[PDB]
Each structure stands twice: as structure tokens, then as C-alpha cells.
Design a protein around this ligand. Structure first.
Ligand SMILES: [Ca+2]
Ligand SMILES: [Ca+2]
Ligand SMILES: [Ca+2]
Ligand SMILES: [Ca+2]
Ligand SMILES: [Ca+2]
Ligand SMILES: [Ca+2]
Lengths: 647, 647
């Protein structure tokens, strides 16, 4: 067993908790596990595609209320206000499920090769994975045999997706940590609602407002909760205002105190609890990483000199360069990283000085063109003058001028968006000219900056891609002047218009203050991804629940639906019949926009007051816990960067 | 001229920028100015009452649209949806205005006595004050003569009230400072709205959504601005969703980006700018305060020894204690203040050590009963055991037990809130007993702690007041059992029930985690008062404007009003006919609850697209700038208080 291989495995496990167990490092037959692990990691993209396909299966699955026999079969996509996504027949669903299950079974049970036997079965996460996959196998086998209270496949596959990604698991652990403090603050919020509703119930006992709205304590509590959400602020206390204008003072006090005090208090408590949870998790990961790096360093130096020389550290570099989970490293980057790692400047790396490897490896991003093969062309008087022009600050001025002229052309073109394509050809030719000038611009920029220097930064690659896609689109439009179903259609023209509008957005980066804010947003989006994914999974679970319980109560032939708020407001296309319909309905409830319309209506269709436990629990878990968290991150990023400029 | 008098004036000016001018300190005839200033400050409560009466005059003034001759006179409070506040006739209005104007004229022109002549006419604040008062005098004289485009008195007296209070002036200066940054971020927000609306206009050109909602660029910009506030989130893009379910992706992107990027960015920018404004203002005030303290210290020490001996420093306090604008100081507190001021512990105060006078004076709040006059009663065997009981921790346990019994009794009372008073007398006697037990409790607490000890803290005073207030009412209810219009009325019984329920809040006072949050809420409001006052003044200005322009367009006989959103939603009692009606309508717009209903409707009644400039500006100035600032203070207070414990 080569010690450098064990050190490379330890570095992989030090970068993140995913890796080989520490209990297999010194045991015999180490390379056999290593090769199997490497082959497994070669297919991470395949595994990711499989998991995403497993999740996206739910969008196309036939709803359970179609599994029965409604009086019209649900192929009439308009009767039940469904729409726009196809349904897999039994054969398609079965073959798709079998494909996904085969890939999942290979993925789940493959670790047994490189984890030994006892280690695989002694891990809680692996036990949960195997339990989920065996439940999935039993469920699909039952489906095959039948061809049943309900199908448990959506929930189990969503759980598999959640625990297949490290970030979602971390988010769930953090939410579990927060749960206690969240329940504590929820108790105070509930006490405030209960006392305020009791006060309102007693005050408006025999008044006109107590005979239409606050009929009992339960109705008063319900309406006061809705009012706390400010979804019906003027509506709820119109009778009180009409009977006595002084009654509005109490409701103004309630709304103001509730909204500002309670809402901001809940947000602050959630942010504090999540910050403490992050502190604990990050401390745990940091200690694990430090311990793993210490073990690796102790393993490497078998001479016990205390420091690592040049050749040994280089050898470690090409031993660990084989992993795909670590950043790519070049040849001279080996020496560059070794030089950067040295802090005491002694051509050697200390035990504590080596504890900064993970940060150091992905830190260079620097350093030469292929245009210097022929020096008779690159070094010329006209070439030199053009090279002087390209870095001249007036080059950006000229580009901005061309962009403004393009802006004028696009605005005048959109002005005549009603007239037919008879007079559109001169403008199309002009935009062809503009696109080809932009192509000349990018080609000249490549011809100046070189190839690799042009490819180092990512924004330049994005500009590269957008320029090519827009120019190939405009060429496809131009070189085919005859009518065709792929070039004379208005959709292609609209796409071309949007392409020019994005190219005109490019202009907005001229203003430094706006460019800073756009850069802050763009940098923020990757860091907000795990929480958005957790919200997406929660919406998936709630959509499964809503299709299960509120399945087909909204129809075109229902009688008691047309007396509800949903039909009167014309939201009947926002329902829980489909999976996509649930995806959009939970988005509409996700913003508190007329959110009580659904809760009022489905409570009527279901016929029980228990159904609101679905929506209330949705509001309490999603809006008060997750969205508050997202808003907290957005505010924190903006506040930190804002303080960063003046600091 | 006594130097100690000049030092006292300088210390008064060092506490806050309000005081005598610095240019009269060395001039002859100081006591004449000092006595006039002292007499003036003796009437600060009268001045405050006068200013508040001037501000509250607007609530009762007859609306201008009544000064004309409508077909029915506006004494019909039901025809124009007015109500509940009386109108002053011409004589009452004239006499009230003359009284207020005379008092304010005395207040404004009095500083001429103690400030010389040139100094009074060389201050910008005095110049604007005299301009406001002369404009008010001209306006009231014109009103008297007439017995006219519009009445300028409301705005003028609102500005007089605004600049009569130092905190409102400071808030206006800070808003003027923020105006530039707020305008920049508003420009960015407007660019976002403009381009998003253009993209939506060209996307949905010939679609069903472009033929009903996005008819033109102006209508699209209007609807997208409304959608930015999520006031009509599902409503606006129903046609797009019904024609193509994929069109919802664009609107989901727009709404999410708006709500979670732009709104929070505006909030962060406003908070950062305002925090910088506080930094500048507080730095200026602190430097001015230190300069004034240095001048005072240089003035007092005429021996130039560099430190003040004890007796002279004590003598300074008898001179400076005559001002009503400085905290009260007791005779024996002089030595304690002198001891606390001394940091180097040398029985003397240094030049730099004198910088902490304003902080030190209002800092002691410590240091004894009158019950010890007879020692034969207080020092008794039973009295000693009672003293042991009262400080025992089980005393609070017994109090809580009594409170829980009171809870059970009052809940059972409220259950039988429908039955009349025959069975209500046993419960009335029960609450008679409970209130008198609480009276025994508070009197016993006085007897064990003393009188001044019972009076030092303010919460004890509040408990004192509420105990007497509730017990006098409960005893007046019982001692007069016959029917009366002041004791047998149901309103009095309801007041008694609310008083008891408010008393039961003490139970929540026990839970430490809830106690901290309630304490933070109580402590925050004193610090939030100037901003709420600024918002109140802005609402006053907008109410004056709305009554002026949207005066009587909402009637019971209007034809085009019943085709608007206002009448259909039954908000007609929320209008701008009155001043109180404007006070509540601006509150409903102040919270974004169905806020576009008014803006849609008055745009129809006025018949111009310019009227929305009233509401849009109201959104831009109040909600984006002021309410965001209030939310920032609430968040900051909660966050700092929460982080205090873990630190
Ligand atoms: Ca790893
Ligand atoms: Ca070594
Ligand atoms: Ca070293
Ligand atoms: Ca003063
Ligand atoms: Ca002295
Ligand atoms: Ca000293």
C-alpha cells in the first residue's frame, strides 16, 4: 500500500465528508477499493442525471384520482382544469421506473465493493438509503403485480433525492437543530393570537361586527390569523368601522403591532437560530478537516523530520491529481502551489503549515498565445497600431456608441411591431450588419488577448456563447428568405428580438454603481441554491399531499365549487389536480397574494375544518421558516457587501 | 455677571443644542436675559399643548369642498360617507384660531427679549418661524375679511409643528441627506421596471394577454409596477396562464426577482444611507457638545489651576439646578455626583475628565421608609415573620396561584357572556374579593418596602396606578346596585371585563424568554417615536392634499363611482372626504392591503392619468423610504438585543 495513495484519499476526505472511510486506509487490499471508487466517481454525472430524472418523474405521473373511475375519464384535460403536460401510460411508466430503479440499485449497492462488508451495514445513512430503495422496489413490484390505499413512491423518491445531495442533508440537519427555538417562538406567536382574538371576541360580543365575523372564538381566531397575514386588512373590520369609527383604532393597533413587532421578531429569531446552527456545523466540519489533514501529514512523513521537501510533495500532487472531486491542477502549478504553501520560506512545509492545502489548491487562476507562431504578421505597423487601439480606453467608447446605435435601431424596429415582414427586411439586414460587427469585435478581442487568456475568465466564455448563438440565429434567418415553418414563424422573430434586447442589457454594466449590484446578485445566486432546493423539495412533498387529499374536488361540473372564492376570483386554473398545477398553486400561496382564497375554498369542498391544517402548516413551515431564511440571506449579503465598499 | 451662571447656561446648551446663544455669554446685562429665558421655559408644557392643539385643529376643520354650494349641503354625513367628528362653525373656528395664533405669536416673538435684536434676525430657524407665523396671520386675516384658490393654513401649521420639535427637524435633515442615494436606487428600480415592462410588452404582442392587459407600453408599465408589490399576483397573468402554461415561468421569474432581490436591495440601501446620516449628525453633535463643555470648563476655572476643587464644583450645581430642561438632582446627590465624576481619584475634576458631565448627572437613580417612626409595631414577632414571608420566593408562587384562580373565574365569567345580570352578581362579588385581595397585596408591598422605595421605579408606579384604577371602578360598580346610566350600562361591564383581562397579562410576565421580548418591545417604542411622528406628519400633508384634490368625488349619488373597484369591494367608507377619513385611508394604503383599489378608482373619478402621481409618490416616499426605515430599526433592535445574551 503506497502511503501517497492513502494521503490522497485522506485529502479527498478532508476537502469534504464524502470519501473513503478512515477504517479502510491501513487494511490490506487497498488498491482494489481505490480502483472501484475511482470508477464509481467517473459516473457522478450519470448518477446526478438519474437522480434528477427520478425526481422529475413526479411531474408526469398519472394522478391517483384518475386511477379510479370518474364519470368522465380524465383524458378530457379541460373538464378538471388540468393541462399541458403528457401522461405516461402503464408501459411507459413501468419501463421508466425500472430503468431508474436499476440505476439506483447499482448506485446504492455498489459501495459494498470498496467499503468491505461490515462497514457498509454499520452506517446510518447507508441503512436509510437501502431502506428507501427496498421500499421503492416493493412498491414498483406491487404496481407490476396489480397490473391500495395510496402510493408511497413520490415521498420515498423525494427523500432519496434529498439525501443524495450533501447540501440538502445539511439543510435538513440545520432545520432539525432550529426546530426547538422555532417552536418556542411559535408558542409566543400563538399566545398573542389567542389573547388578541379573545379580546376581540369579548369586545365585539353583541355588536354588528360580532354577529357577522367574530361569531365564536374559533371563527375569531381564524379571522385574526388571516388578518395577521394582512391578506384581508380592510375587509375583515368593515362592519366594525361602519358601526363605530372608533373601533378602527383597535384594529389599527392590532395590525401594526402584529405586522411590525411580531413579524420582524419571528424573522430575527429564525435568523439567530440558523446562524448558531451554521456556526456549530461549520465548527464540526472544520475540526474534522483539521484532524484529517493532521492524519494525512503524519502518514506522509515516515521519516519524522517534521517537514515535507520538494519531490515528496510533488509526488503527492500527481498521486492526488487522479480524483475528479478535486480542482484541476497543471504541471507548473505543482511548483506554484508548493511555493505558495510555504509561509516561513524554507523550501519545506510544516505540520501546521500543511493544514492549509484545501484552500491553497484552488487559489491560483492565473497564467502565451498561439498567434505568435508567425512573427511577420503579429509584429507589423498596422498590427501594432491596431493593438494600440484595442487597449485604448476609447475602444470602450466606440463599443458603447455602437451599442447606443443598436439600441435606437431595436427601439424603432419594435415601434413597427404591428406591420408585416414586408418592410422588416431593411431592419433585418441592418441587424445582420450589427451582429456581424459584434462578431468582428469578439474575433478582434480574441486576436489581441490570445486564446487561453480569452478562455480563463468565465464571463468572456458567456459572451463567446451568446455572440455565437445570436449570430447563427441571425444567419439562419437571413440565408433562408423563403417562407418556412422554422424561419418565417413569429416565434423565431420574437426570439431574435429578445436576443438583441439582452445584447442591449449589456450596456447597463457601464454604470459602476449598478454593475456592483448586479455582480452582487449574480455572486449571491450560487450560494442560495441549497435553500431554494430545500424549498423546492418541501413544495414537492406538499404537492404530493395535496394531490392525495384534494385530488379532484375542482371540476367543471361541481356544484359547491362555484359558491367558493376560488371560482369567483377566476383562479380555477390554480388548483391541486395535477403535479404542475400544485407547483404553481404553492407558488401563489408562496407569496401571500390572495392566499386565503384557496384556504377558504378547499375548506368548503372538503367539508371539514381539518383541511386548513394543510394550509396553516404550509404557511407556518414555508413562509415563516424558509422564506424568512432566504430573505435573511439576501439582506445579509447586501448589508455585508454594502459595508464592504465603504470599509 | 456670575461665571457660574454662564457655566450653567453652557451646560444647558451642551446637553442639547437648545439654549441661549453663545454670543451673549460675555455681554453685559446677563441676568435680564436669564430670567426671561427661565420664565419662558417654565411654560414649555403650555407651548407643547398649544402646538398639539394647532396640529389637531385640522381634524375638525370644515373641508374646502363644503365651502362651495353642493346640491345637498354637507351636513348630510351619510350622503358623502362622512362621520363621527364634529365640525366647528365659523365663530368657533375663528375664536380657536385666534387663541392659538395669539399663543404662538407670543411664543415666536418672545426670544427677542433674551437674544438681543440682531441675533434674533440672523438665524435661519427664526426667519422661517416668523415667515410661517406671518403667513398664518395673513391667512386668518383673509378668512376674517371674507366673512380664494385654496387654504394654505393646514400645510403652514403642519410645518410649524414639524419645526417646533427638535426630533422632527433632525429627521427631515436626515431625509434630505438621504435624498441623493434614494434617488439613485429609485433610478435603478425604474430602469428594471421599464425594461421588464418592455420585454413583457413585446413578448405578448398579439397574444390573448397582450389584448386585455398589456395593451400598450404605458399600460404594461402600470400593471408591472402594481405587480411589483404583489398586490394582484395571480390576477394580472391569468390570460397568459390560460393561453399558455409556460408563460407563467416568466412571471414567476419577475415576481421572485422583484420581491427577493429589488425590495431587499432597496431596504438595505435605505438602511445604509440612513446609518451614515446618523454617523455624521451624531459626530457633529458630539463635537459641538465637547466644545461647549470645554468652553464651560475654561470659563469656570479662572485660577487656571487645571482642576476644579470640591466646593466650587458643588456650588456649580446649585446654579445649574434651576433649569427645567436638566434632570432633577437632590441635595445629597451633589457629593455622589462629584465622587462619580472623579476617575483619577484626586478629589478634583480634570479638563478632559469634565467631558462626562451630561452622562453622569442622569445616572445615579439610587438611594429610608416612613414606617419606622413607630418601632414598637414594625419590629414585632408577627411583623418579622411577615417580612420573612414577603421576600420568600413562595410569595410570587402564591401570587401566581391567585392569578390562575382569577384566570379560571374570568374565563367562566366570559363563557356566560350572553346571560343577563341576574346570575352575574356572584361573579361580580368574586371579582370584588379578588380586586381587594390585590389591593391588600399592593398595600402590603408598600408596607414591606416603604414609600420612596415603592416609588423609585416606574413599573411599580404603573402597577400602583392600574391597581387603583381597576379597584375604584369595581367598587363603584358594586356599591351602587340599582340601575343607572353610568353603572348598569353594558359598556361599563365590558370595560370592567377588559380591565380584568388586561390584569391577567401578568401571568405571561413570568416566562423569562417571553419577558425579555416584551421588555424589548416596550423599550423600543420611546426610541421609535420621532420616526412615527414624521410618518404622521407626512400622512397629514397627504391628507390635506387628498382632501384638496379628491374632495367630494365619492358620494351616494355619483354615477361613475359604482363602476369602480372602490364601491364593489365596499370600501366607500375609506375615502378622502374628511380629514379622519384620509387618516384611515392612508393607513390602509400604508400596509399594501388591496392598495390598488383606491388608485384604480380615483384615477377613474378624476378622469386623468395624472392622479396616480399622488399614489405612486405616496408609495415611493412613505413605504419605500419611511416604513423600510422603521422596519430597519425594529430588525436592528431585535438583532442587537438577541446577540447581547450570547456575548
Ligand atoms: Ca471528497
Ligand atoms: Ca519528510
Ligand atoms: Ca517551514
Ligand atoms: Ca438645553
Ligand atoms: Ca479651581
Ligand atoms: Ca482629576
Amino acid at each position: 500500500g503506497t502511503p501517497f495513495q492513502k494521503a490522497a484519499a485522506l485529502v479527498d476526505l478532508a476537502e469534504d465528508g464524502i470519501g473513503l472511510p478512515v477504517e479502510i486506509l491501513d487494511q490490506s487490499s487497498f488498491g482494489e477499493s481505490a480502483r472501484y471508487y475511482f470508477i464509481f466517481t467517473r459516473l457522478d454525472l450519470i448518477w446526478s442525471l438519474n437522480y434528477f430524472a427520478l425526481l422529475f418523474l413526479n411531474f408526469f405521473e398519472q394522478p391517483l384520482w384518475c386511477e379510479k373511475n370518474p364519470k368522465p375519464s380524465c383524458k378530457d384535460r379541460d373538464y378538471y382544469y388540468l393541462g399541458e403536460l403528457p401522461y405516461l401510460t402503464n408501459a411507459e411508466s413501468i419501463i421508466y421506473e425500472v430503468i431508474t430503479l436499476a440505476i439506483l440499485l447499482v448506485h446504492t449497492f455498489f459501495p459494498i465493493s470498496y467499503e468491505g462488508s461490515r462497514i457498509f451495514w454499520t452506517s446510518r445513512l447507508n441503512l436509510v438509503k437501502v431502506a428507501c430503495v427496498v421500499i421503492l422496489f416493493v412498491d414498483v413490484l406491487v404496481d407490476f403485480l396489480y397490473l391500495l390505499p395510496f402510493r408511497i413512491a413520490p415521498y420515498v423518491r423525494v427523500i432519496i433525492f434529498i439525501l443524495s445531495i450533501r447540501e440538502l442533508r445539511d439543510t435538513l440537519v440545520l432545520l432539525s437543530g432550529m426546530l426547538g427555538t422555532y417552536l418556542n417562538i411559535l408558542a409566543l406567536w400563538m399566545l398573542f393570537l389567542l389573547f388578541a382574538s379573545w379580546i376581540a371576541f369579548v369586545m365585539f360580543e353583541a355588536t354588528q361586527q360580532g354577529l357577522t365575523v367574530f361569531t365564536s372564538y374559533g371563527a375569531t381566531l381564524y379571522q385574526m390569523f388571516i388578518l395577521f397575514t394582512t391578506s384581508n386588512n380592510p375587509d375583515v373590520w368593515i362592519p366594525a368601522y361602519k358601526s363605530s369609527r372608533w373601533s378602527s383604532v383597535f384594529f389599527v393597533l392590532y395590525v401594526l403591532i402584529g405586522v411590525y413587532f411580531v413579524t420582524n421578531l419571528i424573522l430575527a429569531v429564525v435568523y439567530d437560530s440558523f446562524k448558531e446552527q451554521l456556526a456549530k456545523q461549520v465548527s464540526g466540519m472544520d475540526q474534522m478537516k483539521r484532524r484529517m489533514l493532521e492524519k494525512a501529514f503524519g502518514l506522509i512523513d515516515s521519516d519524522k523530520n517534521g517537514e515535507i521537501d520538494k519531490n515528496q510533495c510533488i509526488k503527492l500532487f500527481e498521486q492526488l491529481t487522479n480524483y475528479r472531486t478535486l480542482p484541476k491542477i497543471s504541471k507548473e502549478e505543482f511548483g506554484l502551489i508548493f511555493d505558495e504553501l510555504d509561509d516561513t520560506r524554507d523550501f519545506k512545509i510544516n505540520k501546521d503549515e500543511f493544514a492549509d492545502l484545501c484552500q491553497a489548491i484552488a487559489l491560483r487562476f492565473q497564467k502565451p498565445s498561439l498567434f505568435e507562431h508567425f512573427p511577420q504578421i503579429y509584429h507589423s505597423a498596422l498590427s501594432q497600431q491596431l493593438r494600440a487601439f484595442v487597449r485604448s480606453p476609447n475602444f470602450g467608447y466606440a463599443i458603447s456608441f455602437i451599442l447606443i446605435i443598436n439600441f435606437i435601431a431595436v427601439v424603432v424596429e419594435t415601434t413597427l411591431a404591428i406591420e408585416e415582414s414586408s418592410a422588416q427586411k431593411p431592419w433585418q439586414v441592418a441587424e445582420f450588419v450589427f451582429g456581424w460587427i459584434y462578431v468582428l469585435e469578439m474575433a478582434l478581442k480574441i486576436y489581441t488577448y490570445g486564446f487561453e487568456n480569452y478562455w480563463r475568465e468565465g464571463a468572456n466564455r458567456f459572451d463567446f456563447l451568446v455572440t455565437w448563438v445570436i449570430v447563427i440565429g441571425e444567419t439562419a434567418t437571413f440565408i433562408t428568405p423563403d417562407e418556412n415553418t422554422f424561419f418565417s414563424n413569429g416565434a423565431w422573430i420574437r426570439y431574435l428580438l429578445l436576443a438583441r434586447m439582452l445584447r442591449l442589457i449589456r450596456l447597463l454594466m457601464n454604470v459602476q454603481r449598478y454593475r456592483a449590484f448586479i455582480a452582487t446578485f449574480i455572486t449571491l445566486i450560487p450560494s442560495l441554491m441549497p435553500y431554494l432546493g430545500t424549498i423546492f423539495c418541501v413544495l414537492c412533498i406538499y404537492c404530493s399531499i395535496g394531490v392525495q387529499v384534494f385530488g379532484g374536488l375542482v371540476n367543471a361540473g361541481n356544484k359547491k365549487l362555484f359558491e367558493t372564492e376560488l371560482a369567483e376570483d377566476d383562479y380555477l386554473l390554480f388548483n391541486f389536480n395535477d403535479y404542475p398545477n400544485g407547483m404553481v398553486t404553492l407558488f401563489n400561496l408562496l407569496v401571500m397574494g390572495n392566499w386565503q382564497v384557496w384556504m377558504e375554498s378547499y375548506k368548503d369542498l372538503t367539508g371539514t375544518w381539518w383541511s386548513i391544517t394543510y394550509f396553516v402548516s404550509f404557511y407556518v413551515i414555508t413562509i415563516l421558516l424558509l422564506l424568512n431564511l432566504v430573505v435573511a440571506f439576501v439582506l445579509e449579503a447586501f448589508f455585508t457587501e454594502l459595508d464592504l465598499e465603504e470599509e
